[PDB]
Symmetry: D4
Amino acid sequence: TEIRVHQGDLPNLDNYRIDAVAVDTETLGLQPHRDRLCVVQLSSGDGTADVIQIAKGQKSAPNLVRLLSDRDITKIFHFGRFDLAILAHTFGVMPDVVFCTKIASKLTRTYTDRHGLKEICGELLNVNISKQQQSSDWAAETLSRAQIEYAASDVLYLHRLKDIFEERLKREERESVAKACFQFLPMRANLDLLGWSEIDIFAHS
Amino acid sequence: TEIRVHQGDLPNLDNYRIDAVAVDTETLGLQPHRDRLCVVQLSSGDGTADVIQIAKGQKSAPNLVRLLSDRDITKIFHFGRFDLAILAHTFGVMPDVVFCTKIASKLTRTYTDRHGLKEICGELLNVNISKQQQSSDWAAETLSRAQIEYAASDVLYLHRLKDIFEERLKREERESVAKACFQFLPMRANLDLLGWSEIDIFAHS
Amino acid sequence: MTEIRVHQGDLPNLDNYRIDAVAVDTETLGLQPHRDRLCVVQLSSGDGTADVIQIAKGQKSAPNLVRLLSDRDITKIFHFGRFDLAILAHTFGVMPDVVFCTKIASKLTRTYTDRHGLKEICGELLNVNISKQQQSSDWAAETLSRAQIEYAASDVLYLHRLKDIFEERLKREERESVAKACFQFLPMRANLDLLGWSEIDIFAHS
Amino acid sequence: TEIRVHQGDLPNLDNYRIDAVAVDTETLGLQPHRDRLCVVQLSSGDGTADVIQIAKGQKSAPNLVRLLSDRDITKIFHFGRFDLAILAHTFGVMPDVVFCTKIASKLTRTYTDRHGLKEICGELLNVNISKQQQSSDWAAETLSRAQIEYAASDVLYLHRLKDIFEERLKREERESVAKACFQFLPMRANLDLLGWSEIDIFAHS
Amino acid sequence: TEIRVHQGDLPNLDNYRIDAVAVDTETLGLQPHRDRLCVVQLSSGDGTADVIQIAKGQKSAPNLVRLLSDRDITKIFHFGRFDLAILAHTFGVMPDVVFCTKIASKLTRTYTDRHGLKEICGELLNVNISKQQQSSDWAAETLSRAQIEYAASDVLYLHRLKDIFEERLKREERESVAKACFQFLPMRANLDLLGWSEIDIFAHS
Amino acid sequence: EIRVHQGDLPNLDNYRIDAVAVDTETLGLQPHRDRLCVVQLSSGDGTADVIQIAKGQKSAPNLVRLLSDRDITKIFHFGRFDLAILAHTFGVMPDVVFCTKIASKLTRTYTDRHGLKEICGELLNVNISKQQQSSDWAAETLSRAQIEYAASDVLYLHRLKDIFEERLKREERESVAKACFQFLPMRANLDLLGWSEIDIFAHS
Amino acid sequence: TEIRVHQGDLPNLDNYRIDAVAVDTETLGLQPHRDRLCVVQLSSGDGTADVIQIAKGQKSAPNLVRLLSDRDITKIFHFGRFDLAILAHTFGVMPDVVFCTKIASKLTRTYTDRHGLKEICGELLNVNISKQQQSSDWAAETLSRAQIEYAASDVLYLHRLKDIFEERLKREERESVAKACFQFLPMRANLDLLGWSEIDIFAHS
Amino acid sequence: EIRVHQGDLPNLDNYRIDAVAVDTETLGLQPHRDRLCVVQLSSGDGTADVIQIAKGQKSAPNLVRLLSDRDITKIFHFGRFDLAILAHTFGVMPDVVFCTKIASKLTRTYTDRHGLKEICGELLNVNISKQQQSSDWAAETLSRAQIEYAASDVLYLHRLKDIFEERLKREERESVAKACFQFLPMRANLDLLGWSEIDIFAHS
């Protein structure tokens, strides 16, 4: 399993001249104003991954941000609500062409109440995600092999999941529903950063 | 306050050659698949209102529906999530240019946790909304005077509220946030009709 | 102005109850029929008058009242009859089987509110004010107070008028067969309570 | 264990000239207005099962529906409240002669709080139900071997359970209680379809 | 209404040569190890009361404690579980002949869920208890008239309440039940002092 | 060794003792609905008696003689329940009792787990298997697993009582425990009378 | 009584050559990162108050901030945990000599569970605080008289409350406890700003 | 190596150090009811001292000298409890402390599990077994499992403190932690005084 580990940014975009990129992040926690971005993971879907260690106080990552800014490239996330918030807060660019496998699961896997990435990968791909390293020191100068493998596992399968969810959205005629949810998702992430992270803005109460 | 009561539909659109229309509904309850649309209320903001009784099984209301589908006219609601759902369910047209005073309140009245229409009208306009008729038999062949006046009260003030909320959204620099929420609101209502009425589609769980 | 006839033990006869439907309510020492004895049974023919029958501790028989409860040609009208049916059947050994319940009817028709209590229904449908102050009182007292007697009668004086309106709503929304099935099961729901399932929704998944 | 897989409907009722038939369904989820009927399973109690794939948009299944409508044949379900709702919603016929093993368990297995089919089969029959396929894509064009065997397992044992529950209902003198519950169950299912799925219609609040 | 205010102790027992004495206390709070005894109130049932201010650090009150120790005198409380604990903690003597109107209410007023002294006095005696001074500085050197009248109101009616509750206990044949509860009540208070104040010692969990 | 009986003990030859371990099995937790099915007894000598109670059975004279004997302490685990169903079935409420669950709550202050399985594991290194706790106790013939489970609930209560008595003495809570045990039969009666969901001593 | 309204800052410190100053704030809400400081209120305890309107984006208030950083002047708050957070976030200076009447109430008024400023003023001073304006638009260019009088009422009585609470802390011998709580309070407010506002940092879980 | 003592350390020869790891065992969570049974200490050299405290014991001069020494930082995991029982038993409240649970809540923001077992697993790959946490700590003779568990609670606190200090420096929270540690003894006193169920800083 080829995983390329980088410091600060991708060295170039030679592996990402593609129409969709799988994206994930690791941080010191769930609160972007307190918990810094530590790792950004990328995959083109070819079974390899890039793991980028982000330094404390790092303000720019030009190659990564070019991908995030590129309207011709769909950014694939699992629960992108979080990744979009921490990426936009750290580097100042909010992606606006996105696909989220958790929203897609909630719109299609109506026969289960389990929408986590581990459960999705098990059902749709018979792929086992191990979450032991999800809670680890992601700010460590040197990531362990277990950490690097876990981080890559979050992007290695998102293209395959998106293809299956797209089939399900088409079958149940929910494509326009999903598109509108993905269109609002960057603003849902912005609402979190602005102070509404605990509020369903559409609820009656 | 002039309240014009109609059966089925507006007679014409002479009072609605305007850029924004205040809209509200009354039904037999909170569940559009079970609880039929009984009343639609409209106001141009000039201190008068139209109260339209909708018959059981009524499939058409051409003048009202023309307004709902006119993209040059903003439809103003309080908690439009509901009105949009029952209107789209009954007549087959989902409005797509909307303003919601409840979402606007949640984005601006951060100094309170009370975002109901009565509380908003009291604070912003010193207008007293009486809610006694909210729970009444809206399917009655003849609406009582109290029902008619209550139904009109829900649209008579939405233009004035929208003007104040727009001032607040500009002051706190949240205009683009509100716009994105309003753009998604018709799809939030569609999600309710499709079976996700109890699900925050953007939540982690 | 309201005529309320107070009796000891039983109605003297059924002269006022040669009718197709009778309004029925009870008062007890509490919500648990195995612990809390039946103290009062209230009846109305719908003519604006009521009968209030004091039931003695240990009383086993009330032949005229029980004749009405057993008469399949007379519909017994209750508000939340789930309770009244349980205590009546537990006390006298006869479970009525032709019933109408205004609380079930409200839950099937007043879909625009979440308040289905008798006070709220009477206020909305009839502009009649029910005062609940005596609901929690010593219903086993040898002599009922005037306030207790008036409160007990108020629970049956309006049920015919409520039933008429609810029947209009059930017809309008085409739910008559739904209500009939609920009313047919209601005596068994009360029996389930007496048998030990009072805290269990027998139809729930969990 | 012989499992006969059919498309759309049984070819005939030659295997169902019996007094009681075990019935189960599979769907895309718990909400009949959103989640379509995908599979209907039947067993005569002879250790074999019929698994019928229902097509999207399928409106009729005359042989199956003849069985469901036959008042001389008791339909045995586990938690029939759900199966009755989706069957009636899909084909327009509500069975009215039924036995439910979950209601029967709640009236007899008073020494436990676990009334699921898996737990009942384990205790009463020493039969192991595996539920891994309960949450799976039941709308798949080709059901997997695991899906087919799971679907059959839900009907293969209901006759044997009903026999035991009938013994328990007789021993504890609750036969007329159970009969009244089964008599109301089709209307409980109708109440769900009509909009009362979240309401205990007999509760004080 | 005659209320005699004392410092430290009764001057003598001339008013308490009786079979039953009504007793209440006031403290700085609900936790006897932290919140000192400030007032002890007594009534013979003759419509007068004694209000005894207890000093900080006071170790003895011989006349009061003589009454509390006298096995021929029933001590009447409302929710004596508390008064018994603070009295025993302060003066080292636990009364063992007691009557509690709250336990009596819970065993007889089965037609209500409100067992507070105010509600009991309203129903049984048409007496209005005002609770405004219940939360006040009971350690003040000089109690206000409102405090003194409130403190007296808690003992002025307990004899009359006990008489009525004894009638109800006889009527419903619960006298032996009540007696066993009263016999255990001093140990329930002791359990509170020893560290089980938050534990129902008889509960399964 | 487990002796299985129908209806009652044949005699009291094994129970001329100062304390007897007692347990029951029923069709459920509600004595007015769920009949007494089994009564289990042990003298503490490592053997047990398992008595099947018939539907509608009104008397069990030898068992009831034990329950009535004030010279014999009845040892239970969570006797609040056993006292209720026994008194409801046979009309005699024992009044000299020891409860290992109350004793645990008064002594095992270093844990929040007071079930019999947990107590036996900690104090005796005895493994209680609870699989048969939820089973058809009204069956005409009890299974071997049922009979062994029923006996296991009484085989160890004497040994537990001895340890809890040491702990009650050590922490000086003997009089507290005695008052709780004295009230326990009335706690069971309160349950039968309709207060099963009410802590009668609580403020609310 | 006399309420002096200022724009931006006090004109001078002529009224604040004192040992202790009462301080309160008003904002657009409870979240300092989202909800800006709008008003700062001060009183010397002489029955007069200064109400200072703070502009959006205002970075400096030199006279007010001199008071906040003067170690010889105790800053008196009610629930200073909030005021300290918004003041330190806005002007960059965290006071470190403070007294909080809510903490003081929780350490002394053990006979009640109501520790809000309204309840405290009612009991200790027979002063009626009206809370109607607490939820109002504090960012308004012109505050209403009701707003100004409410804002002043929050500081007019804190000196008198501090005196009484100091008496209670001495009487119950809790002076050193209160001092340690006050010493930690600025760090509790800092912890809120840093991202732990929903965490009791001393709790087991 | 685990040295077991009765009452007190024999001397302070092993504790001429800058920081000492401290833990306790009791009969439960309520210091006014549940007596101190064991005090455990380690210098960080991989050995531990386990001191059995007698019922009614009022003094432990060598232990208390360590607790009083301002030049020696006392390291705890969830010191809020240990500080309360130590101060209540011997009358001395330590005022120079480090708590690994507070440190975890200030640094391990990527998890919601802050127990000692979870910390040791993540930071050290050390497996803490909690089976003996709920045991009779007042036993005259502690079992080997009890002694080893008691020692395991102090054997690793030095290594944990070192790592947490690195994290506190890295995220610039050193002054935050210091203020929390400064208040921690008074948080413990508040528990003893009657506020154990109250967050004194909460709005409600």
